[PDB]
């Protein structure tokens, strides 16, 4: 039975040599895959001339609303995904992660990119860099989307998560994606892609899928393309030196295997509650998803006097795990995915047993069953710093080794001897052991969890990549970063420094900056709706003289009898030389000068973004305020009962009779719209 590929808008299939997909709990072939004789250059050409100009013609807010709509469409028909995921040998709780945590990444990116990204095709990330003495020459940074494709090469662990966490920043950035999943579990990836395509939510050409080898795709890419890899450390170092990639200098993000430590602290005795949650965390992280997640604990570093207390407490917790079929009852651990995986785990277990020891059911594995089972395995290594095969070999199954250390200076070296890891855990209760651990072992790790009694109630775990924390690590773990929040949408964009006059930078960025021309238009700017405000609508307020009575009235009403405002002997010895006006009174009298009183489109204020007081204000000194619209960035009206609205930022500039700018700042405002959208 053929597995199709979505190329050039059409479902196609290959002709020729083929591989095939076995069932995991029984072991018969129920799909067979090939991609031979298909045109890859035409697929890239259709992607570039069709899906890239459609995505690059949207704002970021529309591109986040598209992600929320696709997420709501894929959440409803979720039960046709659990049926395909049970064929991979996973349980129900171990497939809940793969389905729901991969769909929740879309909701996370839709909520992030609607509150923090502009309503434009470009995205100015900085404020302003003044590069002159008068103010006629400045610069600022911009981020524009590339005009190519993003080629993703996934693994076999998470077909629903690992495809779809690389795809929310790709669509949110403005590029069309081509997915090449692993050919051992591609039948879930095809169902995901088919549910995306057959809904009419994304534009055409914005997603493509190849099932089988890519063949002749990396030899056709241009310098506006990006490539992301996820797999072992032996394939990605062959794909890094591919001559088109090093010729055209295209971004290649490699991310590979790792050895993830879990260090027990010196301040832990077996009567404390730390020991039980340590054992629980190690057992859960070693038995979840049959040990087939990349963020699993594989090196357990314990102190010397607590080895026999740990190695006896793990095994009694581990013998209660019943390995078998996930559909029948009483079974917690499922199976592996292939017989090749059952061979490849045990051929690494034998390499570890060439210099290690044995605590449980290790190299015993039934290599002739109709089902990819492997028993949970705990090893031991009494010479940790004289056996380099422990610190370089990961058995990608339920296997983890145990080794001792000596008082927080040998453990800090055994944790850094992994050569670049992907995750780490420390179990302590002393907050000055965690500081010494972070100051020396955060170089090799990309995510570190400190675990104690308070954190363990609502912790997500050692091996759960959150979609707003950096997922990556140096050295052996590839050297790339994913999922850093909005750090991941910047891997699909070009950063540019634009220079010129401020009145030109304001027209490029569609935001008034500081020195641009203004537009005074004879009616008050708080009387306009959202659709008739443009960035650069300015108001010059009338003046107000700050007298000596104003200082006394504000200090009486507020309560701030500070010595630079109320005393006279001590005011003549400070930095100001005499007693001055309060800063919050300047802040309040400014708002008294520009705020309109009548009922209009302005609803709420709720914000003050960045205030700096520059020069002091004295009695006998006037105040005049300039109010300028700056940024518009509407909201999406998630229901039909609600009111259409948007959020306008106004820049406020105060100055005295000498026109020098005391106290310049910026406020937020929620302005109602005339025409709704949904």
Ligand X SMILES: NC(=O)c1ccc[n+]([C@@H]2O[C@H](COP(=O)([O-])OP(=O)(O)OC[C@H]3O[C@@H](n4cnc5c(N)ncnc54)[C@H](OP(=O)(O)O)[C@@H]3O)[C@@H](O)[C@H]2O)c1
Note the residues at the interface with ligand COO (CB under 6 A).
97, 101, 104, 107-108, 111, 131, 158, 161, 460, 464-466
Nearer to ligand COO, 168 or 671 (CB): 168
608 binds, among ligand X, ligand COO, a second copy, none (CB under 5 to 8 A by kind): a second copy
Write down the least CB distance from residue 652 to ligand X, Å. 41
| β-strands 645-655, 621-631 pairing | antiparallel
Q: State whether residue 180 is helix, strand or coil.
A: strand
660 binds a second copy (CB under 8 A): no
β-pairing, 493-500 vs 138-145, is antiparallel
CA angle 292, 396, 476 (to 5 degrees): 110
294: partner contacted, choices ligand COO, ligand X, a second copy, none (Cβ within 5-8 A by kind): ligand X
Q: Given the complex with ligand COO, which of 360 and 445 has the nearer CB atom?
A: 445
Q: Which of a second copy, ligand X, ligand COO, none lies near 134, with the C-beta cut-off 5 to 8 A by kind?
A: a second copy
Between CA 521 and CA 308 the distance in angstroms is 82
Q: Which residues fall within 8 angstroms of residue 431, CB to CB, at 6 or more apart?
A: none
- Give the whole-angstrom CA distance, residue 33 versus residue 26: 19
Strands 138-145 and 19-22 turn out to be unpaired
For ligand COO, the closer CB: 102 or 265:
102
- Residue 107 interacting entry, from ligand X, a second copy, ligand COO, none, C-beta within 5 to 8 Å by type: ligand COO
Spell out the long-range contacts of 323-332 with Cβ–Cβ below 8 A and sequence spacing 24 or more: 323/373, 323/374, 323/375, 323/376, 324/373, 325/25, 325/371, 326/25, 326/86, 326/89, 326/90, 326/91, 326/92, 327/25, 327/86, 331/91, 332/91, 332/287
308 binds a second copy (CB under 8 A): no
Active-site residues, by number, are 255, 294
Q: Is 214 in the site for a second copy (CB under 8 A)?
A: no
Closest approach, Cβ 44 to a second copy, in A, equals 17
Contact partner, 232, from ligand X, ligand COO, a second copy, none, Cβ < 5-8 Å per class: ligand X
Contacts for 567 with CB less than 8 Å, ≥ 6 apart: 579
Residue 389 touches which member of a second copy, ligand X, ligand COO, none, C-beta under 5-8 Å by kind: none
Q: Which is nearer to a second copy, 53 or 382 (CB)?
A: 53
Whole-angstrom CA distances from 406 to 281, 359, 392, 451 are 22, 22, 22, 20
Find out whether 116 and 631 touch, Cβ atoms under 8 Å: no
Considering only residues 584, 620, 676, 678, which one is a binding residue for a second copy as defined by CB under 8 A?
Answer: 584
Residues 336-395 that bind a second copy (CB under 8 A): none
* Count of beta carbons in the 10 Å neighbourhood of residue 656: 17
Binding mask 366-405 for ligand X (x = CB under 6 A): ------------------------------x---------
Using CB under 6 A as the binding rule, whether residue 525 contacts ligand X is answered as no
Provide CB contacts within 8 A for 143, sequence distance 6+. 122, 123, 124, 125, 490, 493, 494, 495, 496
Q: By CB under 6 A, how many residues form the interface with ligand X?
A: 20
Interacting residue with a second copy among 266, 344, 385, 567 (CB under 8 A): 567
Q: Are strands 665-672 and 645-655 parallel, antiparallel or unpaired?
A: antiparallel
Comparison of 108 and 154: residue with beta carbon closer to ligand COO: 108
| Distance (Å, whole) CA 663 – CA 398 | 62
Please choose which of a second copy, ligand X, ligand COO, none residue 257 contacts, taking the beta carbon within 5 to 8 angstroms, the exact cut-off set by kind: ligand X
**Distance set, CA 206 to CA 50, 188, 190, 211, 377 (Å):** 8, 19, 15, 17, 44
**Which residues neighbour 96 within 8 Å (Cβ) at sequence distance 6 or greater?**
none
Interior angle at CA 519, CA 514 and CA 523, nearest 5? 125
Nearer CB in complex with ligand COO: 397/404: 397
From the list 68-76, 144-152, 230-238, 350-358, the region that binds ligand X by CB under 6 A is 230-238
Among 415, 450, 546, 623, binds a second copy (CB under 8 A): 450
Give the footprint of a second copy on residues 108-167 (CB under 8 A): 121-122, 129, 131-134, 136-137, 139, 141-142, 144-147
Nearer of residues 111 and 406 to ligand COO, judged by Cβ: 111
Binding of ligand X by 470 (CB under 6 A): no
Name residues contacting a second copy, limited to 466-505 (CB under 8 A).
466, 468-470, 474-476, 478-479, 481, 484, 494-501, 503-504
Shorter beta-carbon distance to ligand X: residue 393 or 408: 393
At residue 133, the 3 state secondary structure works out as coil
Selected from 103, 263, 283, 294, the binder of ligand X by CB under 6 A is 294
Sign, Cα dihedral of 310, 313, 317, 320? positive
Question: Out of ligand COO, a second copy, ligand X, none, which partner does residue 111 contact, by CB within 5 to 8 A per kind?
Answer: ligand COO
Q: How far is it, in rounded angstroms, from Cα 191 to Cα 195?
A: 6
Nearer to ligand COO, 464 or 624 (CB): 464
Residue 495: which of ligand X, ligand COO, a second copy, none does it interact with, CB under 5 to 8 A by kind?
Answer: a second copy
From a second copy, ligand COO, ligand X, none, which one binds at residue 141 (CB under 5 to 8 Å depending on kind)?
Answer: a second copy
Distances (CA, A) of 350 to 146, 258, 340: 47, 19, 15
Nearer to a second copy, 387 or 459 (CB): 459
DSSP letters along 37-60, please?
T--SHHHHHHIIIIIHHHHTTS-H
Query: Cβ-count burial of 262 within 10 angstroms (0-12 exposed, 13-18 middle, 19+ buried)?
Result: buried
Among 99, 337, 422, 488, binds ligand X (CB under 6 A): 422
The two three-digit tokens of residue 406, written as one number: 């000596």
Segment contacting a second copy (CB under 8 A): 26-34, 60-68, 111-119, 587-595?
A: 587-595
Q: Radius of gyration (Cα) for the chain, nearest Å? A: 31
Return the residues of window 138-157 that contact ligand X according to CB under 6 A.
153-157
What is Dmax (Cα atoms) for the chain? 96
Residues that bind ligand X (CB under 6 A): 153-157, 182-184, 213-214, 230-232, 235, 255-257, 294, 396, 422
């Amino acid at each position: 039975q053929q597995l199709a590929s979505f190329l050039s808008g059409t479902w196609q299939s290959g002709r020729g040599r083929s591989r095939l997909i076995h069932h995991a709990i029984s072991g018969e072939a129920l799909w067979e895959v090939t991609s031979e004789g298909l045109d890859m250059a035409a697929a890239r050409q259709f992607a570039i001339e069709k899906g890239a100009p459609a995505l690059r013609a949207m704002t970021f807010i529309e591109r986040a609303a598209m992600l929320k709509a696709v997420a709501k469409h894929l959440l409803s028909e979720k039960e046709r995904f659990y049926a395909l995921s049970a064929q991979t040998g996973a349980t129900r709780a171990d497939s809940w992660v793969d389905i729901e945590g991969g769909i929740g990444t879309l909701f996370t990116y839709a909520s992030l990119g609607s509150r923090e990204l502009p309503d434009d095709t470009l995205w100015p990330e900085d404020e302003l860099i003044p590069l002159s003495k008068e103010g006629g020459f400045a610069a600022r940074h911009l981020l524009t989307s590339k005009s190519g494709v993003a080629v993703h090469i996934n693994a076999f662990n998470f077909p629903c998560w690992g495809m779809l966490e690389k795809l929310a920043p790709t669509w949110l950035g403005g590029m069309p994606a081509i997915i090449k999943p692993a050919t051992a579990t591609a039948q879930l990836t095809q169902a995901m892609v088919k549910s995306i395509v057959d809904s009419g939510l994304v534009p055409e050409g914005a997603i493509s899928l190849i099932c089988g080898s890519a063949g002749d795709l990396l030899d056709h890419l241009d310098s506006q393309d990006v490539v992301t890899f996820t797999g072992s450390a032996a394939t990605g170092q062959m794909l890094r030196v591919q001559p088109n990639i090093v010729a055209k200098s295209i971004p290649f993000t490699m991310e590979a295997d790792s050895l993830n430590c879990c260090v027990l602290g010196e301040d832990v005795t077996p009567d404390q509650p730390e020991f039980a949650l340590f054992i629980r965390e190690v057992v859960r992280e070693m038995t979840t998803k049959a040990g087939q997640k990349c963020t699993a604990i594989r090196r357990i570093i314990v102190p010397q006097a607590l080895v026999n207390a740990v190695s006896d407490a793990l095994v009694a917790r581990l013998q209660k795990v019943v390995v078998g079929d996930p559909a029948q009852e009483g079974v917690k651990m499922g199976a592996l995915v292939n017989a090749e995986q059952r061979a490849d785990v045990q051929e690494k277990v034998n390499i570890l047993l060439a210099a290690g020891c044995e605590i449980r059911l290790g190299g015993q594995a039934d290599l002739s069953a109709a089902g990819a089972f492997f028993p949970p395995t705990l090893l031991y290594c009494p010479q940790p710093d004289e056996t380099p095969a422990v610190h370089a070999t990961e058995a990608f199954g339920p296997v983890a080794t145990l080794m001792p250390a000596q008082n927080q200076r040998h453990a800090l070296q055994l944790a850094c001897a992994g050569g670049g890891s992907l995750a780490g855990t420390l179990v302590t209760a002393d907050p000055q052991i965690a500081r010494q651990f972070i100051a020396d072992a955060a170089r090799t790790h990309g995510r570190i969890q400190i675990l104690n009694e308070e954190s363990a109630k609502e912790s997500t775990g050692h091996g759960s990549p959150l979609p707003q924390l950096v997922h990556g690590g140096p050295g052996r773990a590839g050297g790339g970063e994913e999922l850093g929040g909005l750090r991941a949408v910047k891997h699909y964009m070009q950063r540019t420094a634009v220079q010129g006059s401020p009145t030109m930078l304001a027209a490029i960025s569609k935001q008034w900056v500081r020195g641009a021309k203004v537009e005074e238009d004879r009616i008050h700017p708080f009387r306009k709706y959202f659709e008739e405000l443009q960035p650069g609508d300015s108001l010059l307020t009338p003046r107000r003289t700050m007298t000596e009575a104003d200082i006394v009235n504000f200090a009486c009403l507020s309560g701030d009898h500070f010595y630079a405002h109320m005393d006279k002997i001590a005011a003549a010895e400070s930095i100001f030389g005499e007693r001055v006006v309060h800063g919050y009174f300047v802040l309040s009298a400014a708002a008294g000068l520009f705020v309109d009183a009548g009922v209009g489109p302005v609803i709420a204020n709720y914000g003050l973004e960045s205030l700096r007081f520059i020069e002091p204000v004295k009695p006998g000194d006037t105040i005049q305020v300039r109010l300028t619209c700056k940024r518009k960035t509407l909201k999406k009206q998630r229901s039909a009962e609600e009111k259409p609205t948007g959020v306008v930022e106004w820049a406020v500039e105060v100055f005295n009779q000498h026109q020098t700018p005391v106290a310049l700042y910026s406020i937020l405002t929620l302005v109602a719209r005339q025409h709704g959208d949904f």
